[PDB]
Amino acid sequence: IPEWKQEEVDAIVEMIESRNTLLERALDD
Amino acid sequence: GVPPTAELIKDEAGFETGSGEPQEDFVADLSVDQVKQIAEQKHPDLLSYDLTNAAKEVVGTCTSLGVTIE
Amino acid sequence: PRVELEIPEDVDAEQDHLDITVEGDNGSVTRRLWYPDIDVSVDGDTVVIESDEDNAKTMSTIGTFQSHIENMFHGVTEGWEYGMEVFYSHFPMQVNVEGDEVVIENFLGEKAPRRTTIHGDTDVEIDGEELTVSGPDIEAVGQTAADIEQLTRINDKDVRVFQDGVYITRKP
RNA sequence: GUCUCGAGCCCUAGACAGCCGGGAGGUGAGCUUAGAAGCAGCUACCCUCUAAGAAAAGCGUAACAGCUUACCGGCCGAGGU
Ligand SMILES: [Mg+2]
């Protein structure tokens, strides 16, 4: 798991609380 | 309708030429109030939302010519 | 290895020895697929290309047989289309289809007509300046299309000045 | 050509390739120059919007334009380099 993917998955969660597979991994969270 | 940034710096500086070498040779000079006024003019030209980020684009032409900000 | 190919609803493929015959609404294409230890079969409605060996030389043909079958399916459904456009500069070249052979006359100012031959079933039909080679057997079509362009081969002079001849425009 | 073996790195958080889409603005960087606007030459090579996008890597133009290349997204699906 590369570092940039994790910084992005967490940045998408920052705009859910307030790639297509990177959105899905942020939806289940 | 609104003229370019390259032609807007020569009005409120003094000089009309650039330099033989950019950045290294300091020719023109600007200030704090002398950048926030050039930001009041450009709106459909810039992609920025804020009035803070709109200033960063004007500077992105100045340091590459030879301008020191006070 | 084994590769299972799904045959469409419009398609029907029959086997007799090492020969594969593919029938459909556009025609019937018969082919002979042969190579060491590779066996092709029809499991009711699926085509199976299987061999006990996994060496690169065998894998080369298993792959080639797949594209020979997959392309035979397109042959009996939609068909194969090669588009050609006749080009001339100074001489009024005439390309007319006579019998089971396409003929070109007055090429570069020649008294003698340049004639090729239509391979198999393939339909070569002309609409003025255009020509469209069509048929089910890609083997015959691609070759009949080639034969036409190649018939205007000029080795004796510079092709950059002497550009006369039918060329391929559309590749499927 | 083909066979066997080891090594580092990438990959279902979807790799490699291919096909599609996008390839943005401040801005034609500035100087040189009648002119040069990614791409003659000198020097710099900076920041906005964003999922990306070079002060442009390769061609192309008298110059634009055009075509791509880095770079992002999609399709696909298994190993790849
Ligand atoms: Mg000679």
From Swiss-Prot, chain A:
Range of residues in the leader sequence: none
Miscellaneous information on this protein: Has been called L10e and L10E in this organism; in this case 'e/E' is for E.coli-like, not eukaryotic-type protein.
Record family assignment: Belongs to the universal ribosomal protein uL10 family.
Assembly description: Part of the 50S ribosomal subunit. Forms part of the ribosomal stalk which helps the ribosome interact with GTP-bound translation factors. Forms a heptameric L10(L12)2(L12)2(L12)2 complex, where L10 forms an elongated spine to which the L12 dimers bind in a sequential fashion.
Record function comment: Forms part of the ribosomal stalk, playing a central role in the interaction of the ribosome with GTP-bound translation factors.
Protein name: Large ribosomal subunit protein uL10
Whole sequence portion shown: 12 to 73 of 348
Curated annotation (Swiss-Prot), chain B:
Coiled-coil ranges (or none): none
The protein's assembly and partners: Part of the 50S ribosomal subunit. Forms part of the ribosomal stalk which helps the ribosome interact with GTP-bound translation factors. Forms a heptameric L10(L12)2(L12)2(L12)2 complex, where L10 forms an elongated spine to which 3 L12 dimers bind in a sequential fashion.
Family affiliation: Belongs to the universal ribosomal protein uL11 family.
Record's function text: Forms part of the ribosomal stalk which helps the ribosome interact with GTP-bound translation factors.
Protein name: Large ribosomal subunit protein uL11
Organism: Haloarcula marismortui (strain ATCC 43049 / DSM 3752 / JCM 8966 / VKM B-1809) (Halobacterium marismortui)
Span covered, complete protein: 67 to 136 of 162
Swiss-Prot record, chain C:
A Pfam short name: Ribosomal_L6
Gene3D superfamilies listed in its UniProt record: Ribosomal protein L6, alpha-beta domain
Record key words, sorted: Ribonucleoprotein, Ribosomal protein, RNA-binding, rRNA-binding
ATP-binding as UniProt keyword: no
Gene Ontology MF, one: rRNA binding
GO BP terms: cytoplasmic translation
Gene Ontology cellular component list: cytosolic large ribosomal subunit
Subunit structure: Part of the 50S ribosomal subunit. Interacts weakly with protein L13.
Cited function: This protein binds to the 23S rRNA, and is important in its secondary structure. It is located near the subunit interface in the base of the L7/L12 stalk, and near the tRNA binding site of the peptidyltransferase center.
Family membership: Belongs to the universal ribosomal protein uL6 family.
Protein's UniProt name: Large ribosomal subunit protein uL6
Species whose genome carries this gene: Haloarcula marismortui (strain ATCC 43049 / DSM 3752 / JCM 8966 / VKM B-1809)
Origin organism lineage: Archaea, Methanobacteriati, Methanobacteriota, Stenosarchaea group, Halobacteria
